[PDB]
Design a binder for this molecule. Structure first.
Ligand SMILES: O=c1ccn([C@@H]2O[C@H](COP(=O)(O)OP(=O)(O)O[C@H]3O[C@H](CO)[C@H](O)[C@H](O)[C@H]3F)[C@@H](O)[C@H]2O)c(=O)[nH]1
Ligand SMILES: [Mn+2]
Length: 278
């Protein structure tokens, strides 16, 4: 399968751990990594690759200009401008009709094949629902969504790249931002939801298990589809540490954070400059 990550130099060490978590969960599946590189040093690219399978034979870094998204809001402190690079995925990747995009703060704990094998039809992408935002009274509607259109989290996206390449996603994104810049609270995540509402395939929350999903272990909608998708089917396949509390931080009470440390400790090569970060 084809996996996409996006990272600037600051997240290079975390990218490596996340990527290794994907390889570990797929011992007999070819994993082709495509990294939207917003400024990763040559040393860090070599180090990320040195730790992956075959010494990095299956990872390609794609240069992205962070200035491209200079006009987009960045109100969430722990998030850098690189978070918007995903918007030009159709411009950055030509060889794939479908790719599975993952945030850097994820820890894959089970096979992603069921998600990867999902037939997206003419939908724009497949994603898991964000319980936190969905229950934020009146927010969803502020960005033009209907009660029946579920707000998805942008941290795990099975993207119908072939469809994306038929459109100018960045231009559509820019126009949407112009329209909702004064109300959007979740940056790139809002853009994706606004542009694709009504054309989203929903995946089970096991593929994007966040703190709120853990805490839910009332129910916002009676809709059986909503309930089916938000009721996580064990085991968790993807741990997503959405929010300020990261597994590489101090006092991370987030569930499954220990797997991060175990993986970081298994690294083949660990640059002196990564010692602190990891
Ligand atoms: O120093 C940094 C910080 C962030 N990033 C990128 O930005 C993504 C954005 O943020 P987090 O993973 O930390 O975001 P968070 O999960 O907290 O937020 C929710 O809202 C975010 C809004 O901008 C994104 O859409 C994200 O995918 C979604 F899950 C990262 O995965 C990473 O690719 C970097 O490269 N370097
Ligand atoms: Mn994230």
């Amino acid at each position: 399968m084809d996996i996409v990550f996006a990272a600037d130099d600051n997240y290079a060490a975390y990218l490596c751990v996340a990527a290794k978590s994907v390889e570990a969960a797929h011992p007999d599946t070819e994993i082709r990594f495509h990294v939207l590189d917003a400024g990763i040093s040559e040393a860090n690219r070599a180090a990320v690759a040195a730790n992956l399978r075959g010494g990095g034979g299956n990872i390609r870094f794609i240069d992205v200009n962070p200035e491209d998204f200079a006009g987009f809001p960045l109100n969430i402190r722990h998030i850098s401008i690189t978070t918007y690079a995903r918007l030009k995925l159709g411009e950055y990747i030509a060889d794939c009709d479908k790719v599975l995009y993952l945030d850097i703060d994820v820890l894959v704990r089970d096979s992603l094949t069921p998600l990867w094998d999902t037939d997206l039809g003419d939908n724009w992408l497949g994603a898991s629902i964000d319980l936190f935002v969905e229950r934020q009274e009146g927010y969803k509607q502020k960005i033009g969504m209907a009660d029946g259109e579920y707000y998805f989290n942008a941290g795990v996206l099975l993207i119908n790249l072939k469809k994306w390449r038929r459109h100018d996603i960045f231009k559509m994104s820019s126009e949407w931002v112009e329209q909702y810049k004064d109300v959007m609270q979740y940056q790139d995540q809002d853009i994706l939801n606004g542009l694709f509402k009504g054309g989203v395939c929903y995946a089970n929350s096991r593929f994007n298990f966040m703190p709120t999903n853990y805490a839910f272990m009332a129910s916002r909608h009676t809709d059986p589809l909503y309930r089916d998708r938000t009721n996580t089917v064990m085991p968790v396949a993807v741990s997503h540490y959405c929010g300020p509390a990261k597994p590489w931080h101090r006092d991370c009470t987030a569930w499954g954070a220990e797997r991060f440390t175990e993986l970081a400790g298994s690294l083949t090569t660990v640059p002196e400059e990564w010692r602190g970060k990891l």
